[PDB]
C-alpha cells in the first residue's frame, strides 16, 4: 500500500509499486 | 500464562527438556524446592529394586544468553500424579503451558505522541507489580596465570585501595556469598608481578618528602563492570595440580 | 497496563493483533466474572453451571 | 498522530453541537469546546484577525 | 447518513481508518482495500499470475 | 558521583551541542545537531519530527 | 567537485521545456527552471521587449512574471556548459540548498549531489513486479512538427515520415501536448486549424 | 533512427552533442525516479555528468604536444590549448569522451 | 512526611487583559491536577457581568436603513463588551446617540453602579443620516458559561475569561527525579485582572475544600 | 541559546566565514585575552559571539582592525 | 510550513513547527482515535459479485 | 464466536469501550478498543545496548580506539565522512579523524 | 446563586472489607468532574503506606537459594511477603519475627502480634511447609511511607548493611488499589443542575476510607497554600 518500508506484491500491473509498512 | 492461546504451547513446554516429566506415575513423597521424590505405583514399577523416583530440579544457573534457568516444583505434597505427566515447572512454562511473556491490558489510542511511530507507553502499575521483571545470571572470571616476572596472586593484599573498599573480600580475597555489589567493587583480588617503575624526578621527590613506599605489583583485581550491580551467588575455583591452594580454596 | 498506537496497526497489516485483543478482552471479562462468583461465593452449582 | 490530530481538529460534520451559531473569534471556540458546550467540528461563522 | 433539521444527507465518513487512510497518517487505498475485501492475485516463482 | 558535579555538567552541557546519527546514513541530514537535555534513563530521545 | 570560483564567464546552457514523453505533462516548466541562472535574454515571442535579463536568478518572483508572459522556451545556464577549469562556477549551478539564497562560494556540491541520489535508493526495487491512437486531453490547436504530409484518395492527411511529432498550440502560445504519430496515420486534420477538448484528432493502427 | 532498440550514451554524444547526452541522462533517471514518486532536481545529475565526460581523446596534435589518440581531462588540455589559441601558434583538436561512473 | 511546598514567580507581558504565569516546584503528577482544576474553575464558574439580552427600537433577521453593518454582527460587538456591576443584580442601559459617525462604548448611558472598562469599544458604527438608532440593553451575571441558543437572545458570557491554559513540562531541584513546573496562560476581558482572577478561582475552590482537612501547619 | 543562527547569516554573508569569524572571536574570549561586548546571559563563548555578530558590531574586519591595533600597540611596547 | 518559512523566515517556521508538533499530539490524544473490529467495512455486495 | 463469547461476559460486540483521561478526567470522545494482548519483552535490553567513552584503551597495532565491554564511537564510516562533507562543516571532520 | 455552595461527605456505603463507595451530594454545574478526578490523581498518588521493607531470614545469604524444608523459593517468599497488608498506629517502623515449624501451611497469623499490629487478612499464604522437622524464624521489617520505593534506589546512603542476611525487597506503599468516579445527576427539591458524586474505591482495608478522603482534600488545600488562608 504506502509508506515504504517492504513492498506490496499484489497489485493490478502498471501501479508504480508499493512500498508499504 | 498465554491468555490467548493455540493448544500447542503445551507440547512445546512438555517436549521441551526445560519442564520435569515425571518417568513412573504414583503419589509425591517429598516437596522440596530442591527436589521432589515421587512414590512409584506398583503397576508401573518393576519387581525388584522397589525404590522410588527422585527428581533432582535444577536450581539457579547460567545459560548461554547469560539468562537464568530455575525449575519450580508444580504439584503438592502428596498429590496423585500420572505418568508422562508435569512435575516441576522450568522457566517461562507455566503448569504446562509455554508463557513466553504476559497477557496485559491494552489500548489503541494515540496518547500524546508517546507511542509515536511503534514507541510503547507503559504504565507504572505494570512496573511496580513486577511482572516483567527479569534475571540476569553473569559470569566474571578472575585468572592468576604465570607471568615471565613470576607468579600472580590472589591474596587480598591489595595496594592502593581502601581497606573499607576491600571489606567485602575474605581472608583471601574473593567476595563473600550473597554480599550485593555494584560497579567497580572488588570481586576478586589478584596482583601482578611488576618492576622497574623507572619513575621520574618530581615522583621520587614527592617519594621522598612523604616516605611512601611505591608497590612493585600492579593491580588487575577482578572488579564489578561499569553500570551493573547485583548480588554473588555462587563462587568457584579451579585451582592446578597440587600447587598450593588459596585459604578460601 | 499499555497505551499502543493504532497507526501501528493499518500500515503494518497485522489485524490478528487486534483480534488477540478483542478476544482476551472477552477471557477476561468471563474470568472477572468468575471472580465475582468466588467472592460472592455462592456454591458449586452456580459456579459449576456457568 | 500529529497529521491525525491537526486532520481530527479542522473538519466540519453536517451537524453537532452548537451548529452555525457565532463567535467574536478564536478564544471563544476554546471557551466553547473546553467546557464541553460545542463540539470539535460545526459549521460556523466567527470573527477572525488575519 | 446524517440528519440536520432535515430527514437524510451524506457526508465523508468518520470511520477511524477511513482518516487514518485519507489525511495521509498512516496507509493508503491498497491497505484498506486488503484489510476488507478480496486481496488481489499473487503469482508462482515462475513469476506466473494464479 | 558527587551531588555537586551534576550542577557542572549543567554548566558545560548548556551551549554545547551534540551530533546524532543513524546507522543508514543516506543524505547529510542522517546526522543532525541538537542540544543536549539531561534525562534520567539510559535512552536517547530524539524529536518526532527529525 | 567544490566551488572554486563564483563565475567564468561561459554563456552556453541548456533549453528548458515542460518534459512530455508523448501523452500529458508530466513534470510543468516552473518545477525544471526554478532556482536556476538564465543563460540569455529574455523576449515575448514578437521581441516586445526584454523582460528578464542574462544574469538574474529565477526566483520565485521571476517564475510568477514568465508564467505571466507564458513563454515555454527557456534557455537557462546548467552545471556541464561551465567554463571554469577544476571546478564550478557559483551561477551556473543554480541558487538550490536547505537555504534559499543563493550557492555560497565554497560549498561541496558533487558530494550533496552523491547523497541526494543515494536517499532514493533505498525506496527503489531490486526485482519488479509483473510488469490504439491519440486522443487529445485539453482543447488547442494542431501544429504538426518535423513531417512529411500527403492528401490520399479520402482527403485526409496521411503522414509519410517516421520522425513526426504532434503539439497541441492553445490561445497563448504555450505547449502542454505533444505526442510522437508512426509513419503512416491519419489525419483528419493538418497544421493549421483548431480542434476541441476530447476529440479525436489522428488514428493509426498499431501493429 | 537507422534502427530499432536501445542506444549506448558514448554514441549518442558523438553524434548528437554534449547537451543532448546529458538531456537523455537526465530525463531517463528522471523517469525512472518519477516513476517510484521521488523527486530530484536535475542539478545533481547535470554535476554528475560533467564529472563523467571529464576526459576526451585528442585528435589532431596541432602545435601541441599531445599525442594523436592519448585521452586526457577536458579541462586541461582546455586551458592549454586555450593559451595556445590566444597565441598565434595553431590549437589541438579534442573529441568528447564518455567514461562510465 | 514532608510535601512540597511550591511558591510562584513572577511573569506576565500583555500589560493588562493577558497574562502566564509558572509556578515550581510541584510534585509529580500535582501539575496536570491543579492545572486542570484550576482551569475547569476559571472558565465554568467566574463572578462576571455581560450580555444577555437587548432591547431593539429596529426590530434576528431583519436590515436597519443606514448601517452596513448586519444584526448578529452587532450582537457579537455585544458580546465582547467589559460590564462590571456593582450590588445591582440586573442592570439594564440604553443607546441614545445618532449621527454620522461609529456608536462606540461611550456613546451609552452612563447609570449608578455601571462601568465599563473599554469606551472605546466598537459596538456598532452608523452610516450618513439621522438615521433611528436607540435601545435598551440588561445585563445578567452567572457562575458559569450559558449560551442563550439553549433557550432577541444573546450568548452570555459570564466568566471574565476568554481563553486559558496550562502547559505541564519536567522541573529539577537539585536531587530530583521528575517534578513538575505548572505553566498557566489567561486572558481577561478587562474587568478583572488574571493576576486576581487565578487567586479568586481557586478561592472557589479553597471555599469548596475548607470543610475536611485540619492540622495544615506543622 | 541560540536557536536560528539566520540573523548572523544575514549580517555576514556566506554562513561559512560567519562560523570563522566567530570561532575567532570565541578564541580571543574564551582564552582570555579579551572580553564580551554584549552581556554575557550565562551563555559560553559559542552564542556570544554569534550574539555579538548578530548585533553587527562583530565581523572580520573589525576584529582585523582590531588586531592591527594591537601589533602597533606592542610596537608602542618596545619603548 | 512552507509558505510559512517562503513569508516570515525561519525564525517562526521552527516556532510554528514546535507548536504544530504539540497541539497535533494533543488533539490526537484527546480524539481518542482507534480500530476495532468492526471498523472495517464489508459489503454484501462481495458475494454477490464473487458468485 | 469472539461477539458470542464477549455476550457471556458484559462487554460490548465492538470490543469497544469508553475510556477517561487520567490528566483531565473528561471523556474520550470516539470509542476505543481495549483489550488483553499477550506481549513478549525481547532481550535487547537499553542496559545491554547503551555505551559510552571519552578517552579508553587503544589498538595496538593501528592506535585506534576499540578495546575492553564495547568501547570506541559507533565507527565513523565513509558515509558519515561524506554526511560531514555535504556540510559545510570541516574541522569537525578534521577533529574527528585526526584529534 | 452569589457564590457560593460546597459539597459535603454524605452516606459512606461500605461494602466488603476491601473496598467502598463514597458520596457527596451538592455539587455545581460541572464541579462533580473537576473534583472527582483531583480526588482520583491525589488519592492515586499520595496516602500513607506501611509496606514490608527488610527481611532477615534464619539461614540465607541471599534471595536465589532454597530453604531445605520449603517447596517456594526465596524469592518467591520474599515476592509474597511484599503483598502483606498490615497497618500501625504509633510507630513509623516496625520489627516483627515470625517462627513457625512441622507440615502446614504458614499463614499471615503466625507472627507475634505487637502492639499497633493490626492484621487485615490472617490466611494470606507467605509459605507452605514440607517436613516435620522444618524451621523457619526471621525478622520482619516494616516502614510507613508514600509511593513506590524500588529498592535499588535505596542503595545510596547504605550505611553498612554489612548484615548480608538482610534482604531488600520493594516498597509498595498504598492502601488504594482501584479508585472510580461516577457523576450522576442529583435533583435537589427544586434545582435542575446539581449533581452526586460516587466514589467507589479499592482498599486492602489498610486505612479506613473517611481518613483517606479527609486527607487527600487536606494535601490538596495544602497545595493551594502558595495564596491560601482560612476563612
Ligand atoms: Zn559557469
Known amino acids: 500500500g504506502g509508506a515504504g518500508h517492504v513492498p506490496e506484491y499484489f497489485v493490478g500491473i502498471g501501479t508504480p509499486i508499493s512500498f508499504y509498512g | 500464562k498465554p491468555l490467548v492461546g493455540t493448544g500447542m504451547e503445551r507440547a512445546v513446554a512438555v517436549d521441551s527438556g526445560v519442564t520435569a516429566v515425571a518417568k513412573r506415575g504414583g503419589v509425591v513423597q517429598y516437596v522440596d524446592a530442591s527436589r521432589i521424590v515421587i512414590k512409584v505405583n506398583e503397576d508401573e514399577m518393576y519387581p525388584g529394586e522397589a525404590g522410588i523416583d527422585i527428581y533432582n530440579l535444577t536450581k539457579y544457573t547460567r545459560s548461554n544468553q547469560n539468562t537464568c534457568i530455575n525449575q519450580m516444583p508444580c504439584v503438592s505434597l502428596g498429590e496423585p500424579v500420572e505418568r508422562g505427566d508435569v512435575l516441576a515447572d522450568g522457566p517461562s512454562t507455566d503448569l504446562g503451558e509455554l508463557a513466553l511473556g504476559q497477557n496485559m491490558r491494552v489500548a489503541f489510542m494515540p496518547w500524546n505522541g508517546y507511542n509515536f511511530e511503534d514507541s510503547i507507553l507503559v504504565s507504572e502499575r505494570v512496573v511496580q507489580e513486577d511482572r516483567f ?61 611488576k618492576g622497574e617503575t623507572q619513575l621520574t624526578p618530581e615522583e621520587k621527590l614527592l617519594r621522598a618528602i612523604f616516605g611512601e613506599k611505591a608497590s612493585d605489583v600492579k593491580d588487575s583485581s577482578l572488579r564489578v563492570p561499569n553500570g551493573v550491580s547485583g548480588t554473588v551467588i555462587d563462587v568457584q575455583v579451579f585451582t592446578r595440580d597440587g600447587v598450593e591452594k588459596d585459604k578460601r580454596a | ?33 468468575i471472580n465475582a462468583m468466588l467472592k460472592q461465593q455462592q456454591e458449586v452449582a452456580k459456579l459449576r453451571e456457568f | 498522530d500529529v497529521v491525525l490530530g491537526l486532520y481530527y481538529m479542522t473538519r466540519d460534520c453536517v451537524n453537532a453541537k452548537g451548529e452555525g451559531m457565532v463567535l467574536t473569534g478564536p478564544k471563544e471556540a476554546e471557551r466553547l469546546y473546553r467546557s464541553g458546550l460545542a463540539s470539535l467540528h460545526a459549521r460556523v461563522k466567527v470573527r477572525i484577525t488575519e | 447518513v446524517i440528519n440536520r433539521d432535515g430527514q437524510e444527507e451524506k457526508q465523508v465518513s468518520f470511520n477511524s481508518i477511513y482518516m487514518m487512510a485519507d489525511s495521509g497518517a498512516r496507509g493508503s487505498a491498497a491497505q484498506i482495500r486488503q484489510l476488507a475485501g478480496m486481496r488481489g492475485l499473487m503469482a508462482k516463482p515462475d513469476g506466473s499470475i494464479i | 558521583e558527587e551531588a555537586v558535579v551534576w550542577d557542572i555538567l549543567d554548566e558545560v552541557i548548556r551551549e554545547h551541542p551534540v551530533l546524532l546519527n543513524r546507522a543508514p546514513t543516506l543524505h547529510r541530514l542522517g546526522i543532525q545537531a541538537f542540544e543536549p537535555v539531561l534525562i534520567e534513563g539510559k535512552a536517547i530521545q530524539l524529536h518526532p519530527l527529525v | 567537485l567544490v566551488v572554486t570560483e563564483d563565475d567564468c564567464g561561459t554563456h552556453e546552457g541548456i533549453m528548458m521545456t515542460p518534459v512530455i514523453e508523448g501523452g500529458d505533462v508530466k513534470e510543468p516548466l516552473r518545477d525544471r527552471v526554478l532556482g536556476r541562472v538564465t543563460a540569455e535574454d529574455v523576449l515575448k515571442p514578437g521581441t516586445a521587449d526584454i523582460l528578464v535579463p542574462r544574469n538574474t536568478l529565477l526566483h520565485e518572483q521571476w517564475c510568477d512574471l514568465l508564467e505571466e508572459n507564458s513563454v515555454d522556451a527557456v534557455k537557462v545556464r546548467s552545471v556541464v556548459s561551465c567554463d571554469t577549469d577544476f571546478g564550478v562556477c557559483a551561477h551556473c549551478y543554480g541558487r538550490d540548498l536547505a537555504r534559499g539564497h543563493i550557492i555560497n562560494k565554497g560549498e561541496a556540491i558533487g558530494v550533496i549531489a552523491a547523497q541526494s541520489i543515494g536517499e532514493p535508493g533505498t525506496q527503489l526495487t531490486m526485482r519488479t513486479f509483473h510488469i490504439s491512437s491519440i486522443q487529445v486531453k485539453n482543447k488547442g490547436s494542431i501544429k504538426l512538427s518535423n513531417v512529411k504530409s500527403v492528401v490520399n484518395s479520402s482527403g485526409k492527411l496521411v503522414i509519410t515520415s517516421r520522425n513526426t511529432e504532434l503539439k497541441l498550440i492553445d490561445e497563448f502560445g504555450r505547449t502542454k501536448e505533444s505526442y510522437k504519430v508512426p509513419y503512416g496515420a491519419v489525419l483528419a486534420k493538418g497544421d493549421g486549424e483548431q480542434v476541441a477538448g476530447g476529440e479525436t484528432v489522428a488514428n493509426w493502427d498499431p501493429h | 533512427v537507422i534502427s530499432d532498440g536501445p542506444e549506448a550514451p558514448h554514441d549518442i554524444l558523438r553524434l548528437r552533442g554534449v547537451h543532448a547526452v546529458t538531456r537523455y541522462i537526465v530525463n531517463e533517471v528522471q523517469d525512472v525516479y518519477r516513476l517510484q514518486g521521488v523527486k530530484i532536481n536535475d542539478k545533481h545529475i547535470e554535476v554528475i555528468v560533467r564529472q563523467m565526460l571529464r576526459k576526451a581523446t585528442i585528435v589532431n596534435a596541432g602545435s601541441s604536444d599531445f599525442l594523436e589518440g592519448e585521452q586526457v581531462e577536458y579541462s586541461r588540455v582546455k586551458i592549454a590549448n586555450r593559451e595556445l589559441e590566444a597565441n598565434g601558434k595553431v590549437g589541438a583538436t579534442y573529441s568528447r569522451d564518455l567514461l562510465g561512473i | 512526611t514532608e510535601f512540597l511546598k511550591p511558591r510562584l514567580v513572577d511573569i506576565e507581558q500583555v500589560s493588562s487583559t493577558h497574562a502566564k504565569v509558572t509556578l515550581e516546584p510541584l510534585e509529580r503528577g500535582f501539575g496536570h491536577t491543579l492545572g486542570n482544576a484550576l482551569r475547569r474553575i476559571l472558565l465554568s464558574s467566574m463572578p462576571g457581568c455581560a450580555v444577555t439580552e437587548v432591547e431593539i427600537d429596529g426590530v434576528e433577521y431583519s436590515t436597519k436603513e443606514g448601517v452596513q453593518e448586519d444584526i448578529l454582527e452587532i450582537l457579537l460587538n455585544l458580546k465582547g463588551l467589559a460590564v462590571r456591576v456593582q450590588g445591582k443584580d440586573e442592570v439594564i442601559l440604553t ?13 451609552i448611558t452612563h447609570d449608578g453602579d455601571v462601568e465599563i472598562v473599554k469606551p472605546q469599544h466598537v459596538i456598532c458604527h452608523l452610516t450618513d443620516e439621522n438615521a433611528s438608532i436607540s435601545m435598551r440593553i440588561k445585563v445578567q451575571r452567572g457562575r458559569g458559561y450559558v ?43 478587562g474587568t478583572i485582572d488574571p493576576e486576581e482572577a487565578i487567586r479568586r478561582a481557586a478561592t472557589i475552590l479553597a471555599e469548596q475544600l475548607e470543610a475536611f482537612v485540619d492540622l495544615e501547619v506543622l | 541559546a541560540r536557536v536560528t543562527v539566520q540573523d548572523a547569516v544575514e549580517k555576514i554573508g556566506n554562513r561559512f566565514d560567519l562560523v570563522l569569524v566567530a570561532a575567532r572571536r570565541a578564541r580571543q574570549m574564551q582564552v582570555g585575552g579579551k572580553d564580551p561586548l554584549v552581556p554575557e546571559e550565562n551563555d559560553k563563548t559559542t552564542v556570544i559571539a554569534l550574539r555579538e555578530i548578530e548585533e553587527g558590531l562583530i565581523n572580520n574586519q573589525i576584529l582585523d582592525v582590531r588586531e592591527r591595533q594591537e601589533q602597533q600597540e606592542q610596537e608602542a611596547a618596545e619603548l | 510550513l512552507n509558505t510559512c518559512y517562503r513569508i516570515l523566515g525561519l525564525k517562526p517556521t521552527v516556532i510554528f513547527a514546535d507548536q504544530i508538533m504539540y497541539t497535533g499530539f494533543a488533539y490526537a490524544a484527546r480524539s481518542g482515535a482507534s480500530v476495532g473490529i468492526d471498523d472495517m467495512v464489508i459489503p454484501e455486495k462481495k458475494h454477490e459479485i464473487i458468485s | 464466536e469472539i461477539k458470542e463469547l464477549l455476550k457471556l461476559g458484559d462487554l460490548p460486540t465492538s470490543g469497544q469501550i469508553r475510556l477517561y483521561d487520567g490528566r483531565t478526567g473528561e471523556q474520550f470522545e470516539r470509542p476505543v478498543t481495549v483489550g488483553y494482548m499477550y506481549m513478549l519483552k525481547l532481550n535487547h535490553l537499553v542496559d545491554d545496548k547503551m555505551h559510552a567513552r571519552s578517552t579508553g584503551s587503544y589498538s595496538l597495532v593501528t592506535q585506534q580506539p576499540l578495546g575492553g565491554a564495547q568501547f ?27 584529534v
Open chain 9, 95 to 107: 443607546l441614545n446617540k445618532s449621527g454620522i459617525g461609529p456608536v462606540t462604548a461611550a456613546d
Open chain 3, 1 to 33: 497496563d499499555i497505551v499502543l498506537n493504532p497507526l501501528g496497526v493499518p500500515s503494518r497489516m497485522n489485524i490478528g493483533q487486534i483480534l488477540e485483543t478483542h478476544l482476551g478482552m472477552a477471557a477476561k471479562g468471563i474470568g472477572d466474572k
Open chain 9, 147 to 189: 449560551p442563550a441558543s439553549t433557550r432577541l437572545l444573546v450568548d452570555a458570557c459570564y466568566s471574565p475569561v476568554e481563553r486559558i491554559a496550562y502547559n505541564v513540562e519536567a522541573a529539577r531541584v537539585e536531587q530530583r527525579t521528575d517534578l513538575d513546573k505548572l505553566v498557566i496562560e489567561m486572558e481577561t476581558n
Open chain 2, 133 to 193: 521483571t527479569t534475571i540476569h545470571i553473569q559470569e566474571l572470571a578472575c585468572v592468576s596465570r604465570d607471568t615471565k616476572l613470576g607468579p600472580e596472586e590472589i591474596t587480598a593484599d591489595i595496594p592502593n585501595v581502601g581497606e573499607a573498599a576491600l571489606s567485602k573480600l575474605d581472608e583471601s580475597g574473593i567476595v563473600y556469598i550473597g554480599a550485593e555489589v555494584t560497579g567497580g567493587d572488588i570481586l576478586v583480588g589478584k596482583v601482578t608481578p
Open chain 12, 72 to 98: 570506541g564511537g559507533q565507527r565513523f564510516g565513509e558515509m558519515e565522512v561524506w554526511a560531514l562533507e555535504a556540510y559545510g562543516a570541516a574541522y569537525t571532520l578534521q577533529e574527528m579523524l585526526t
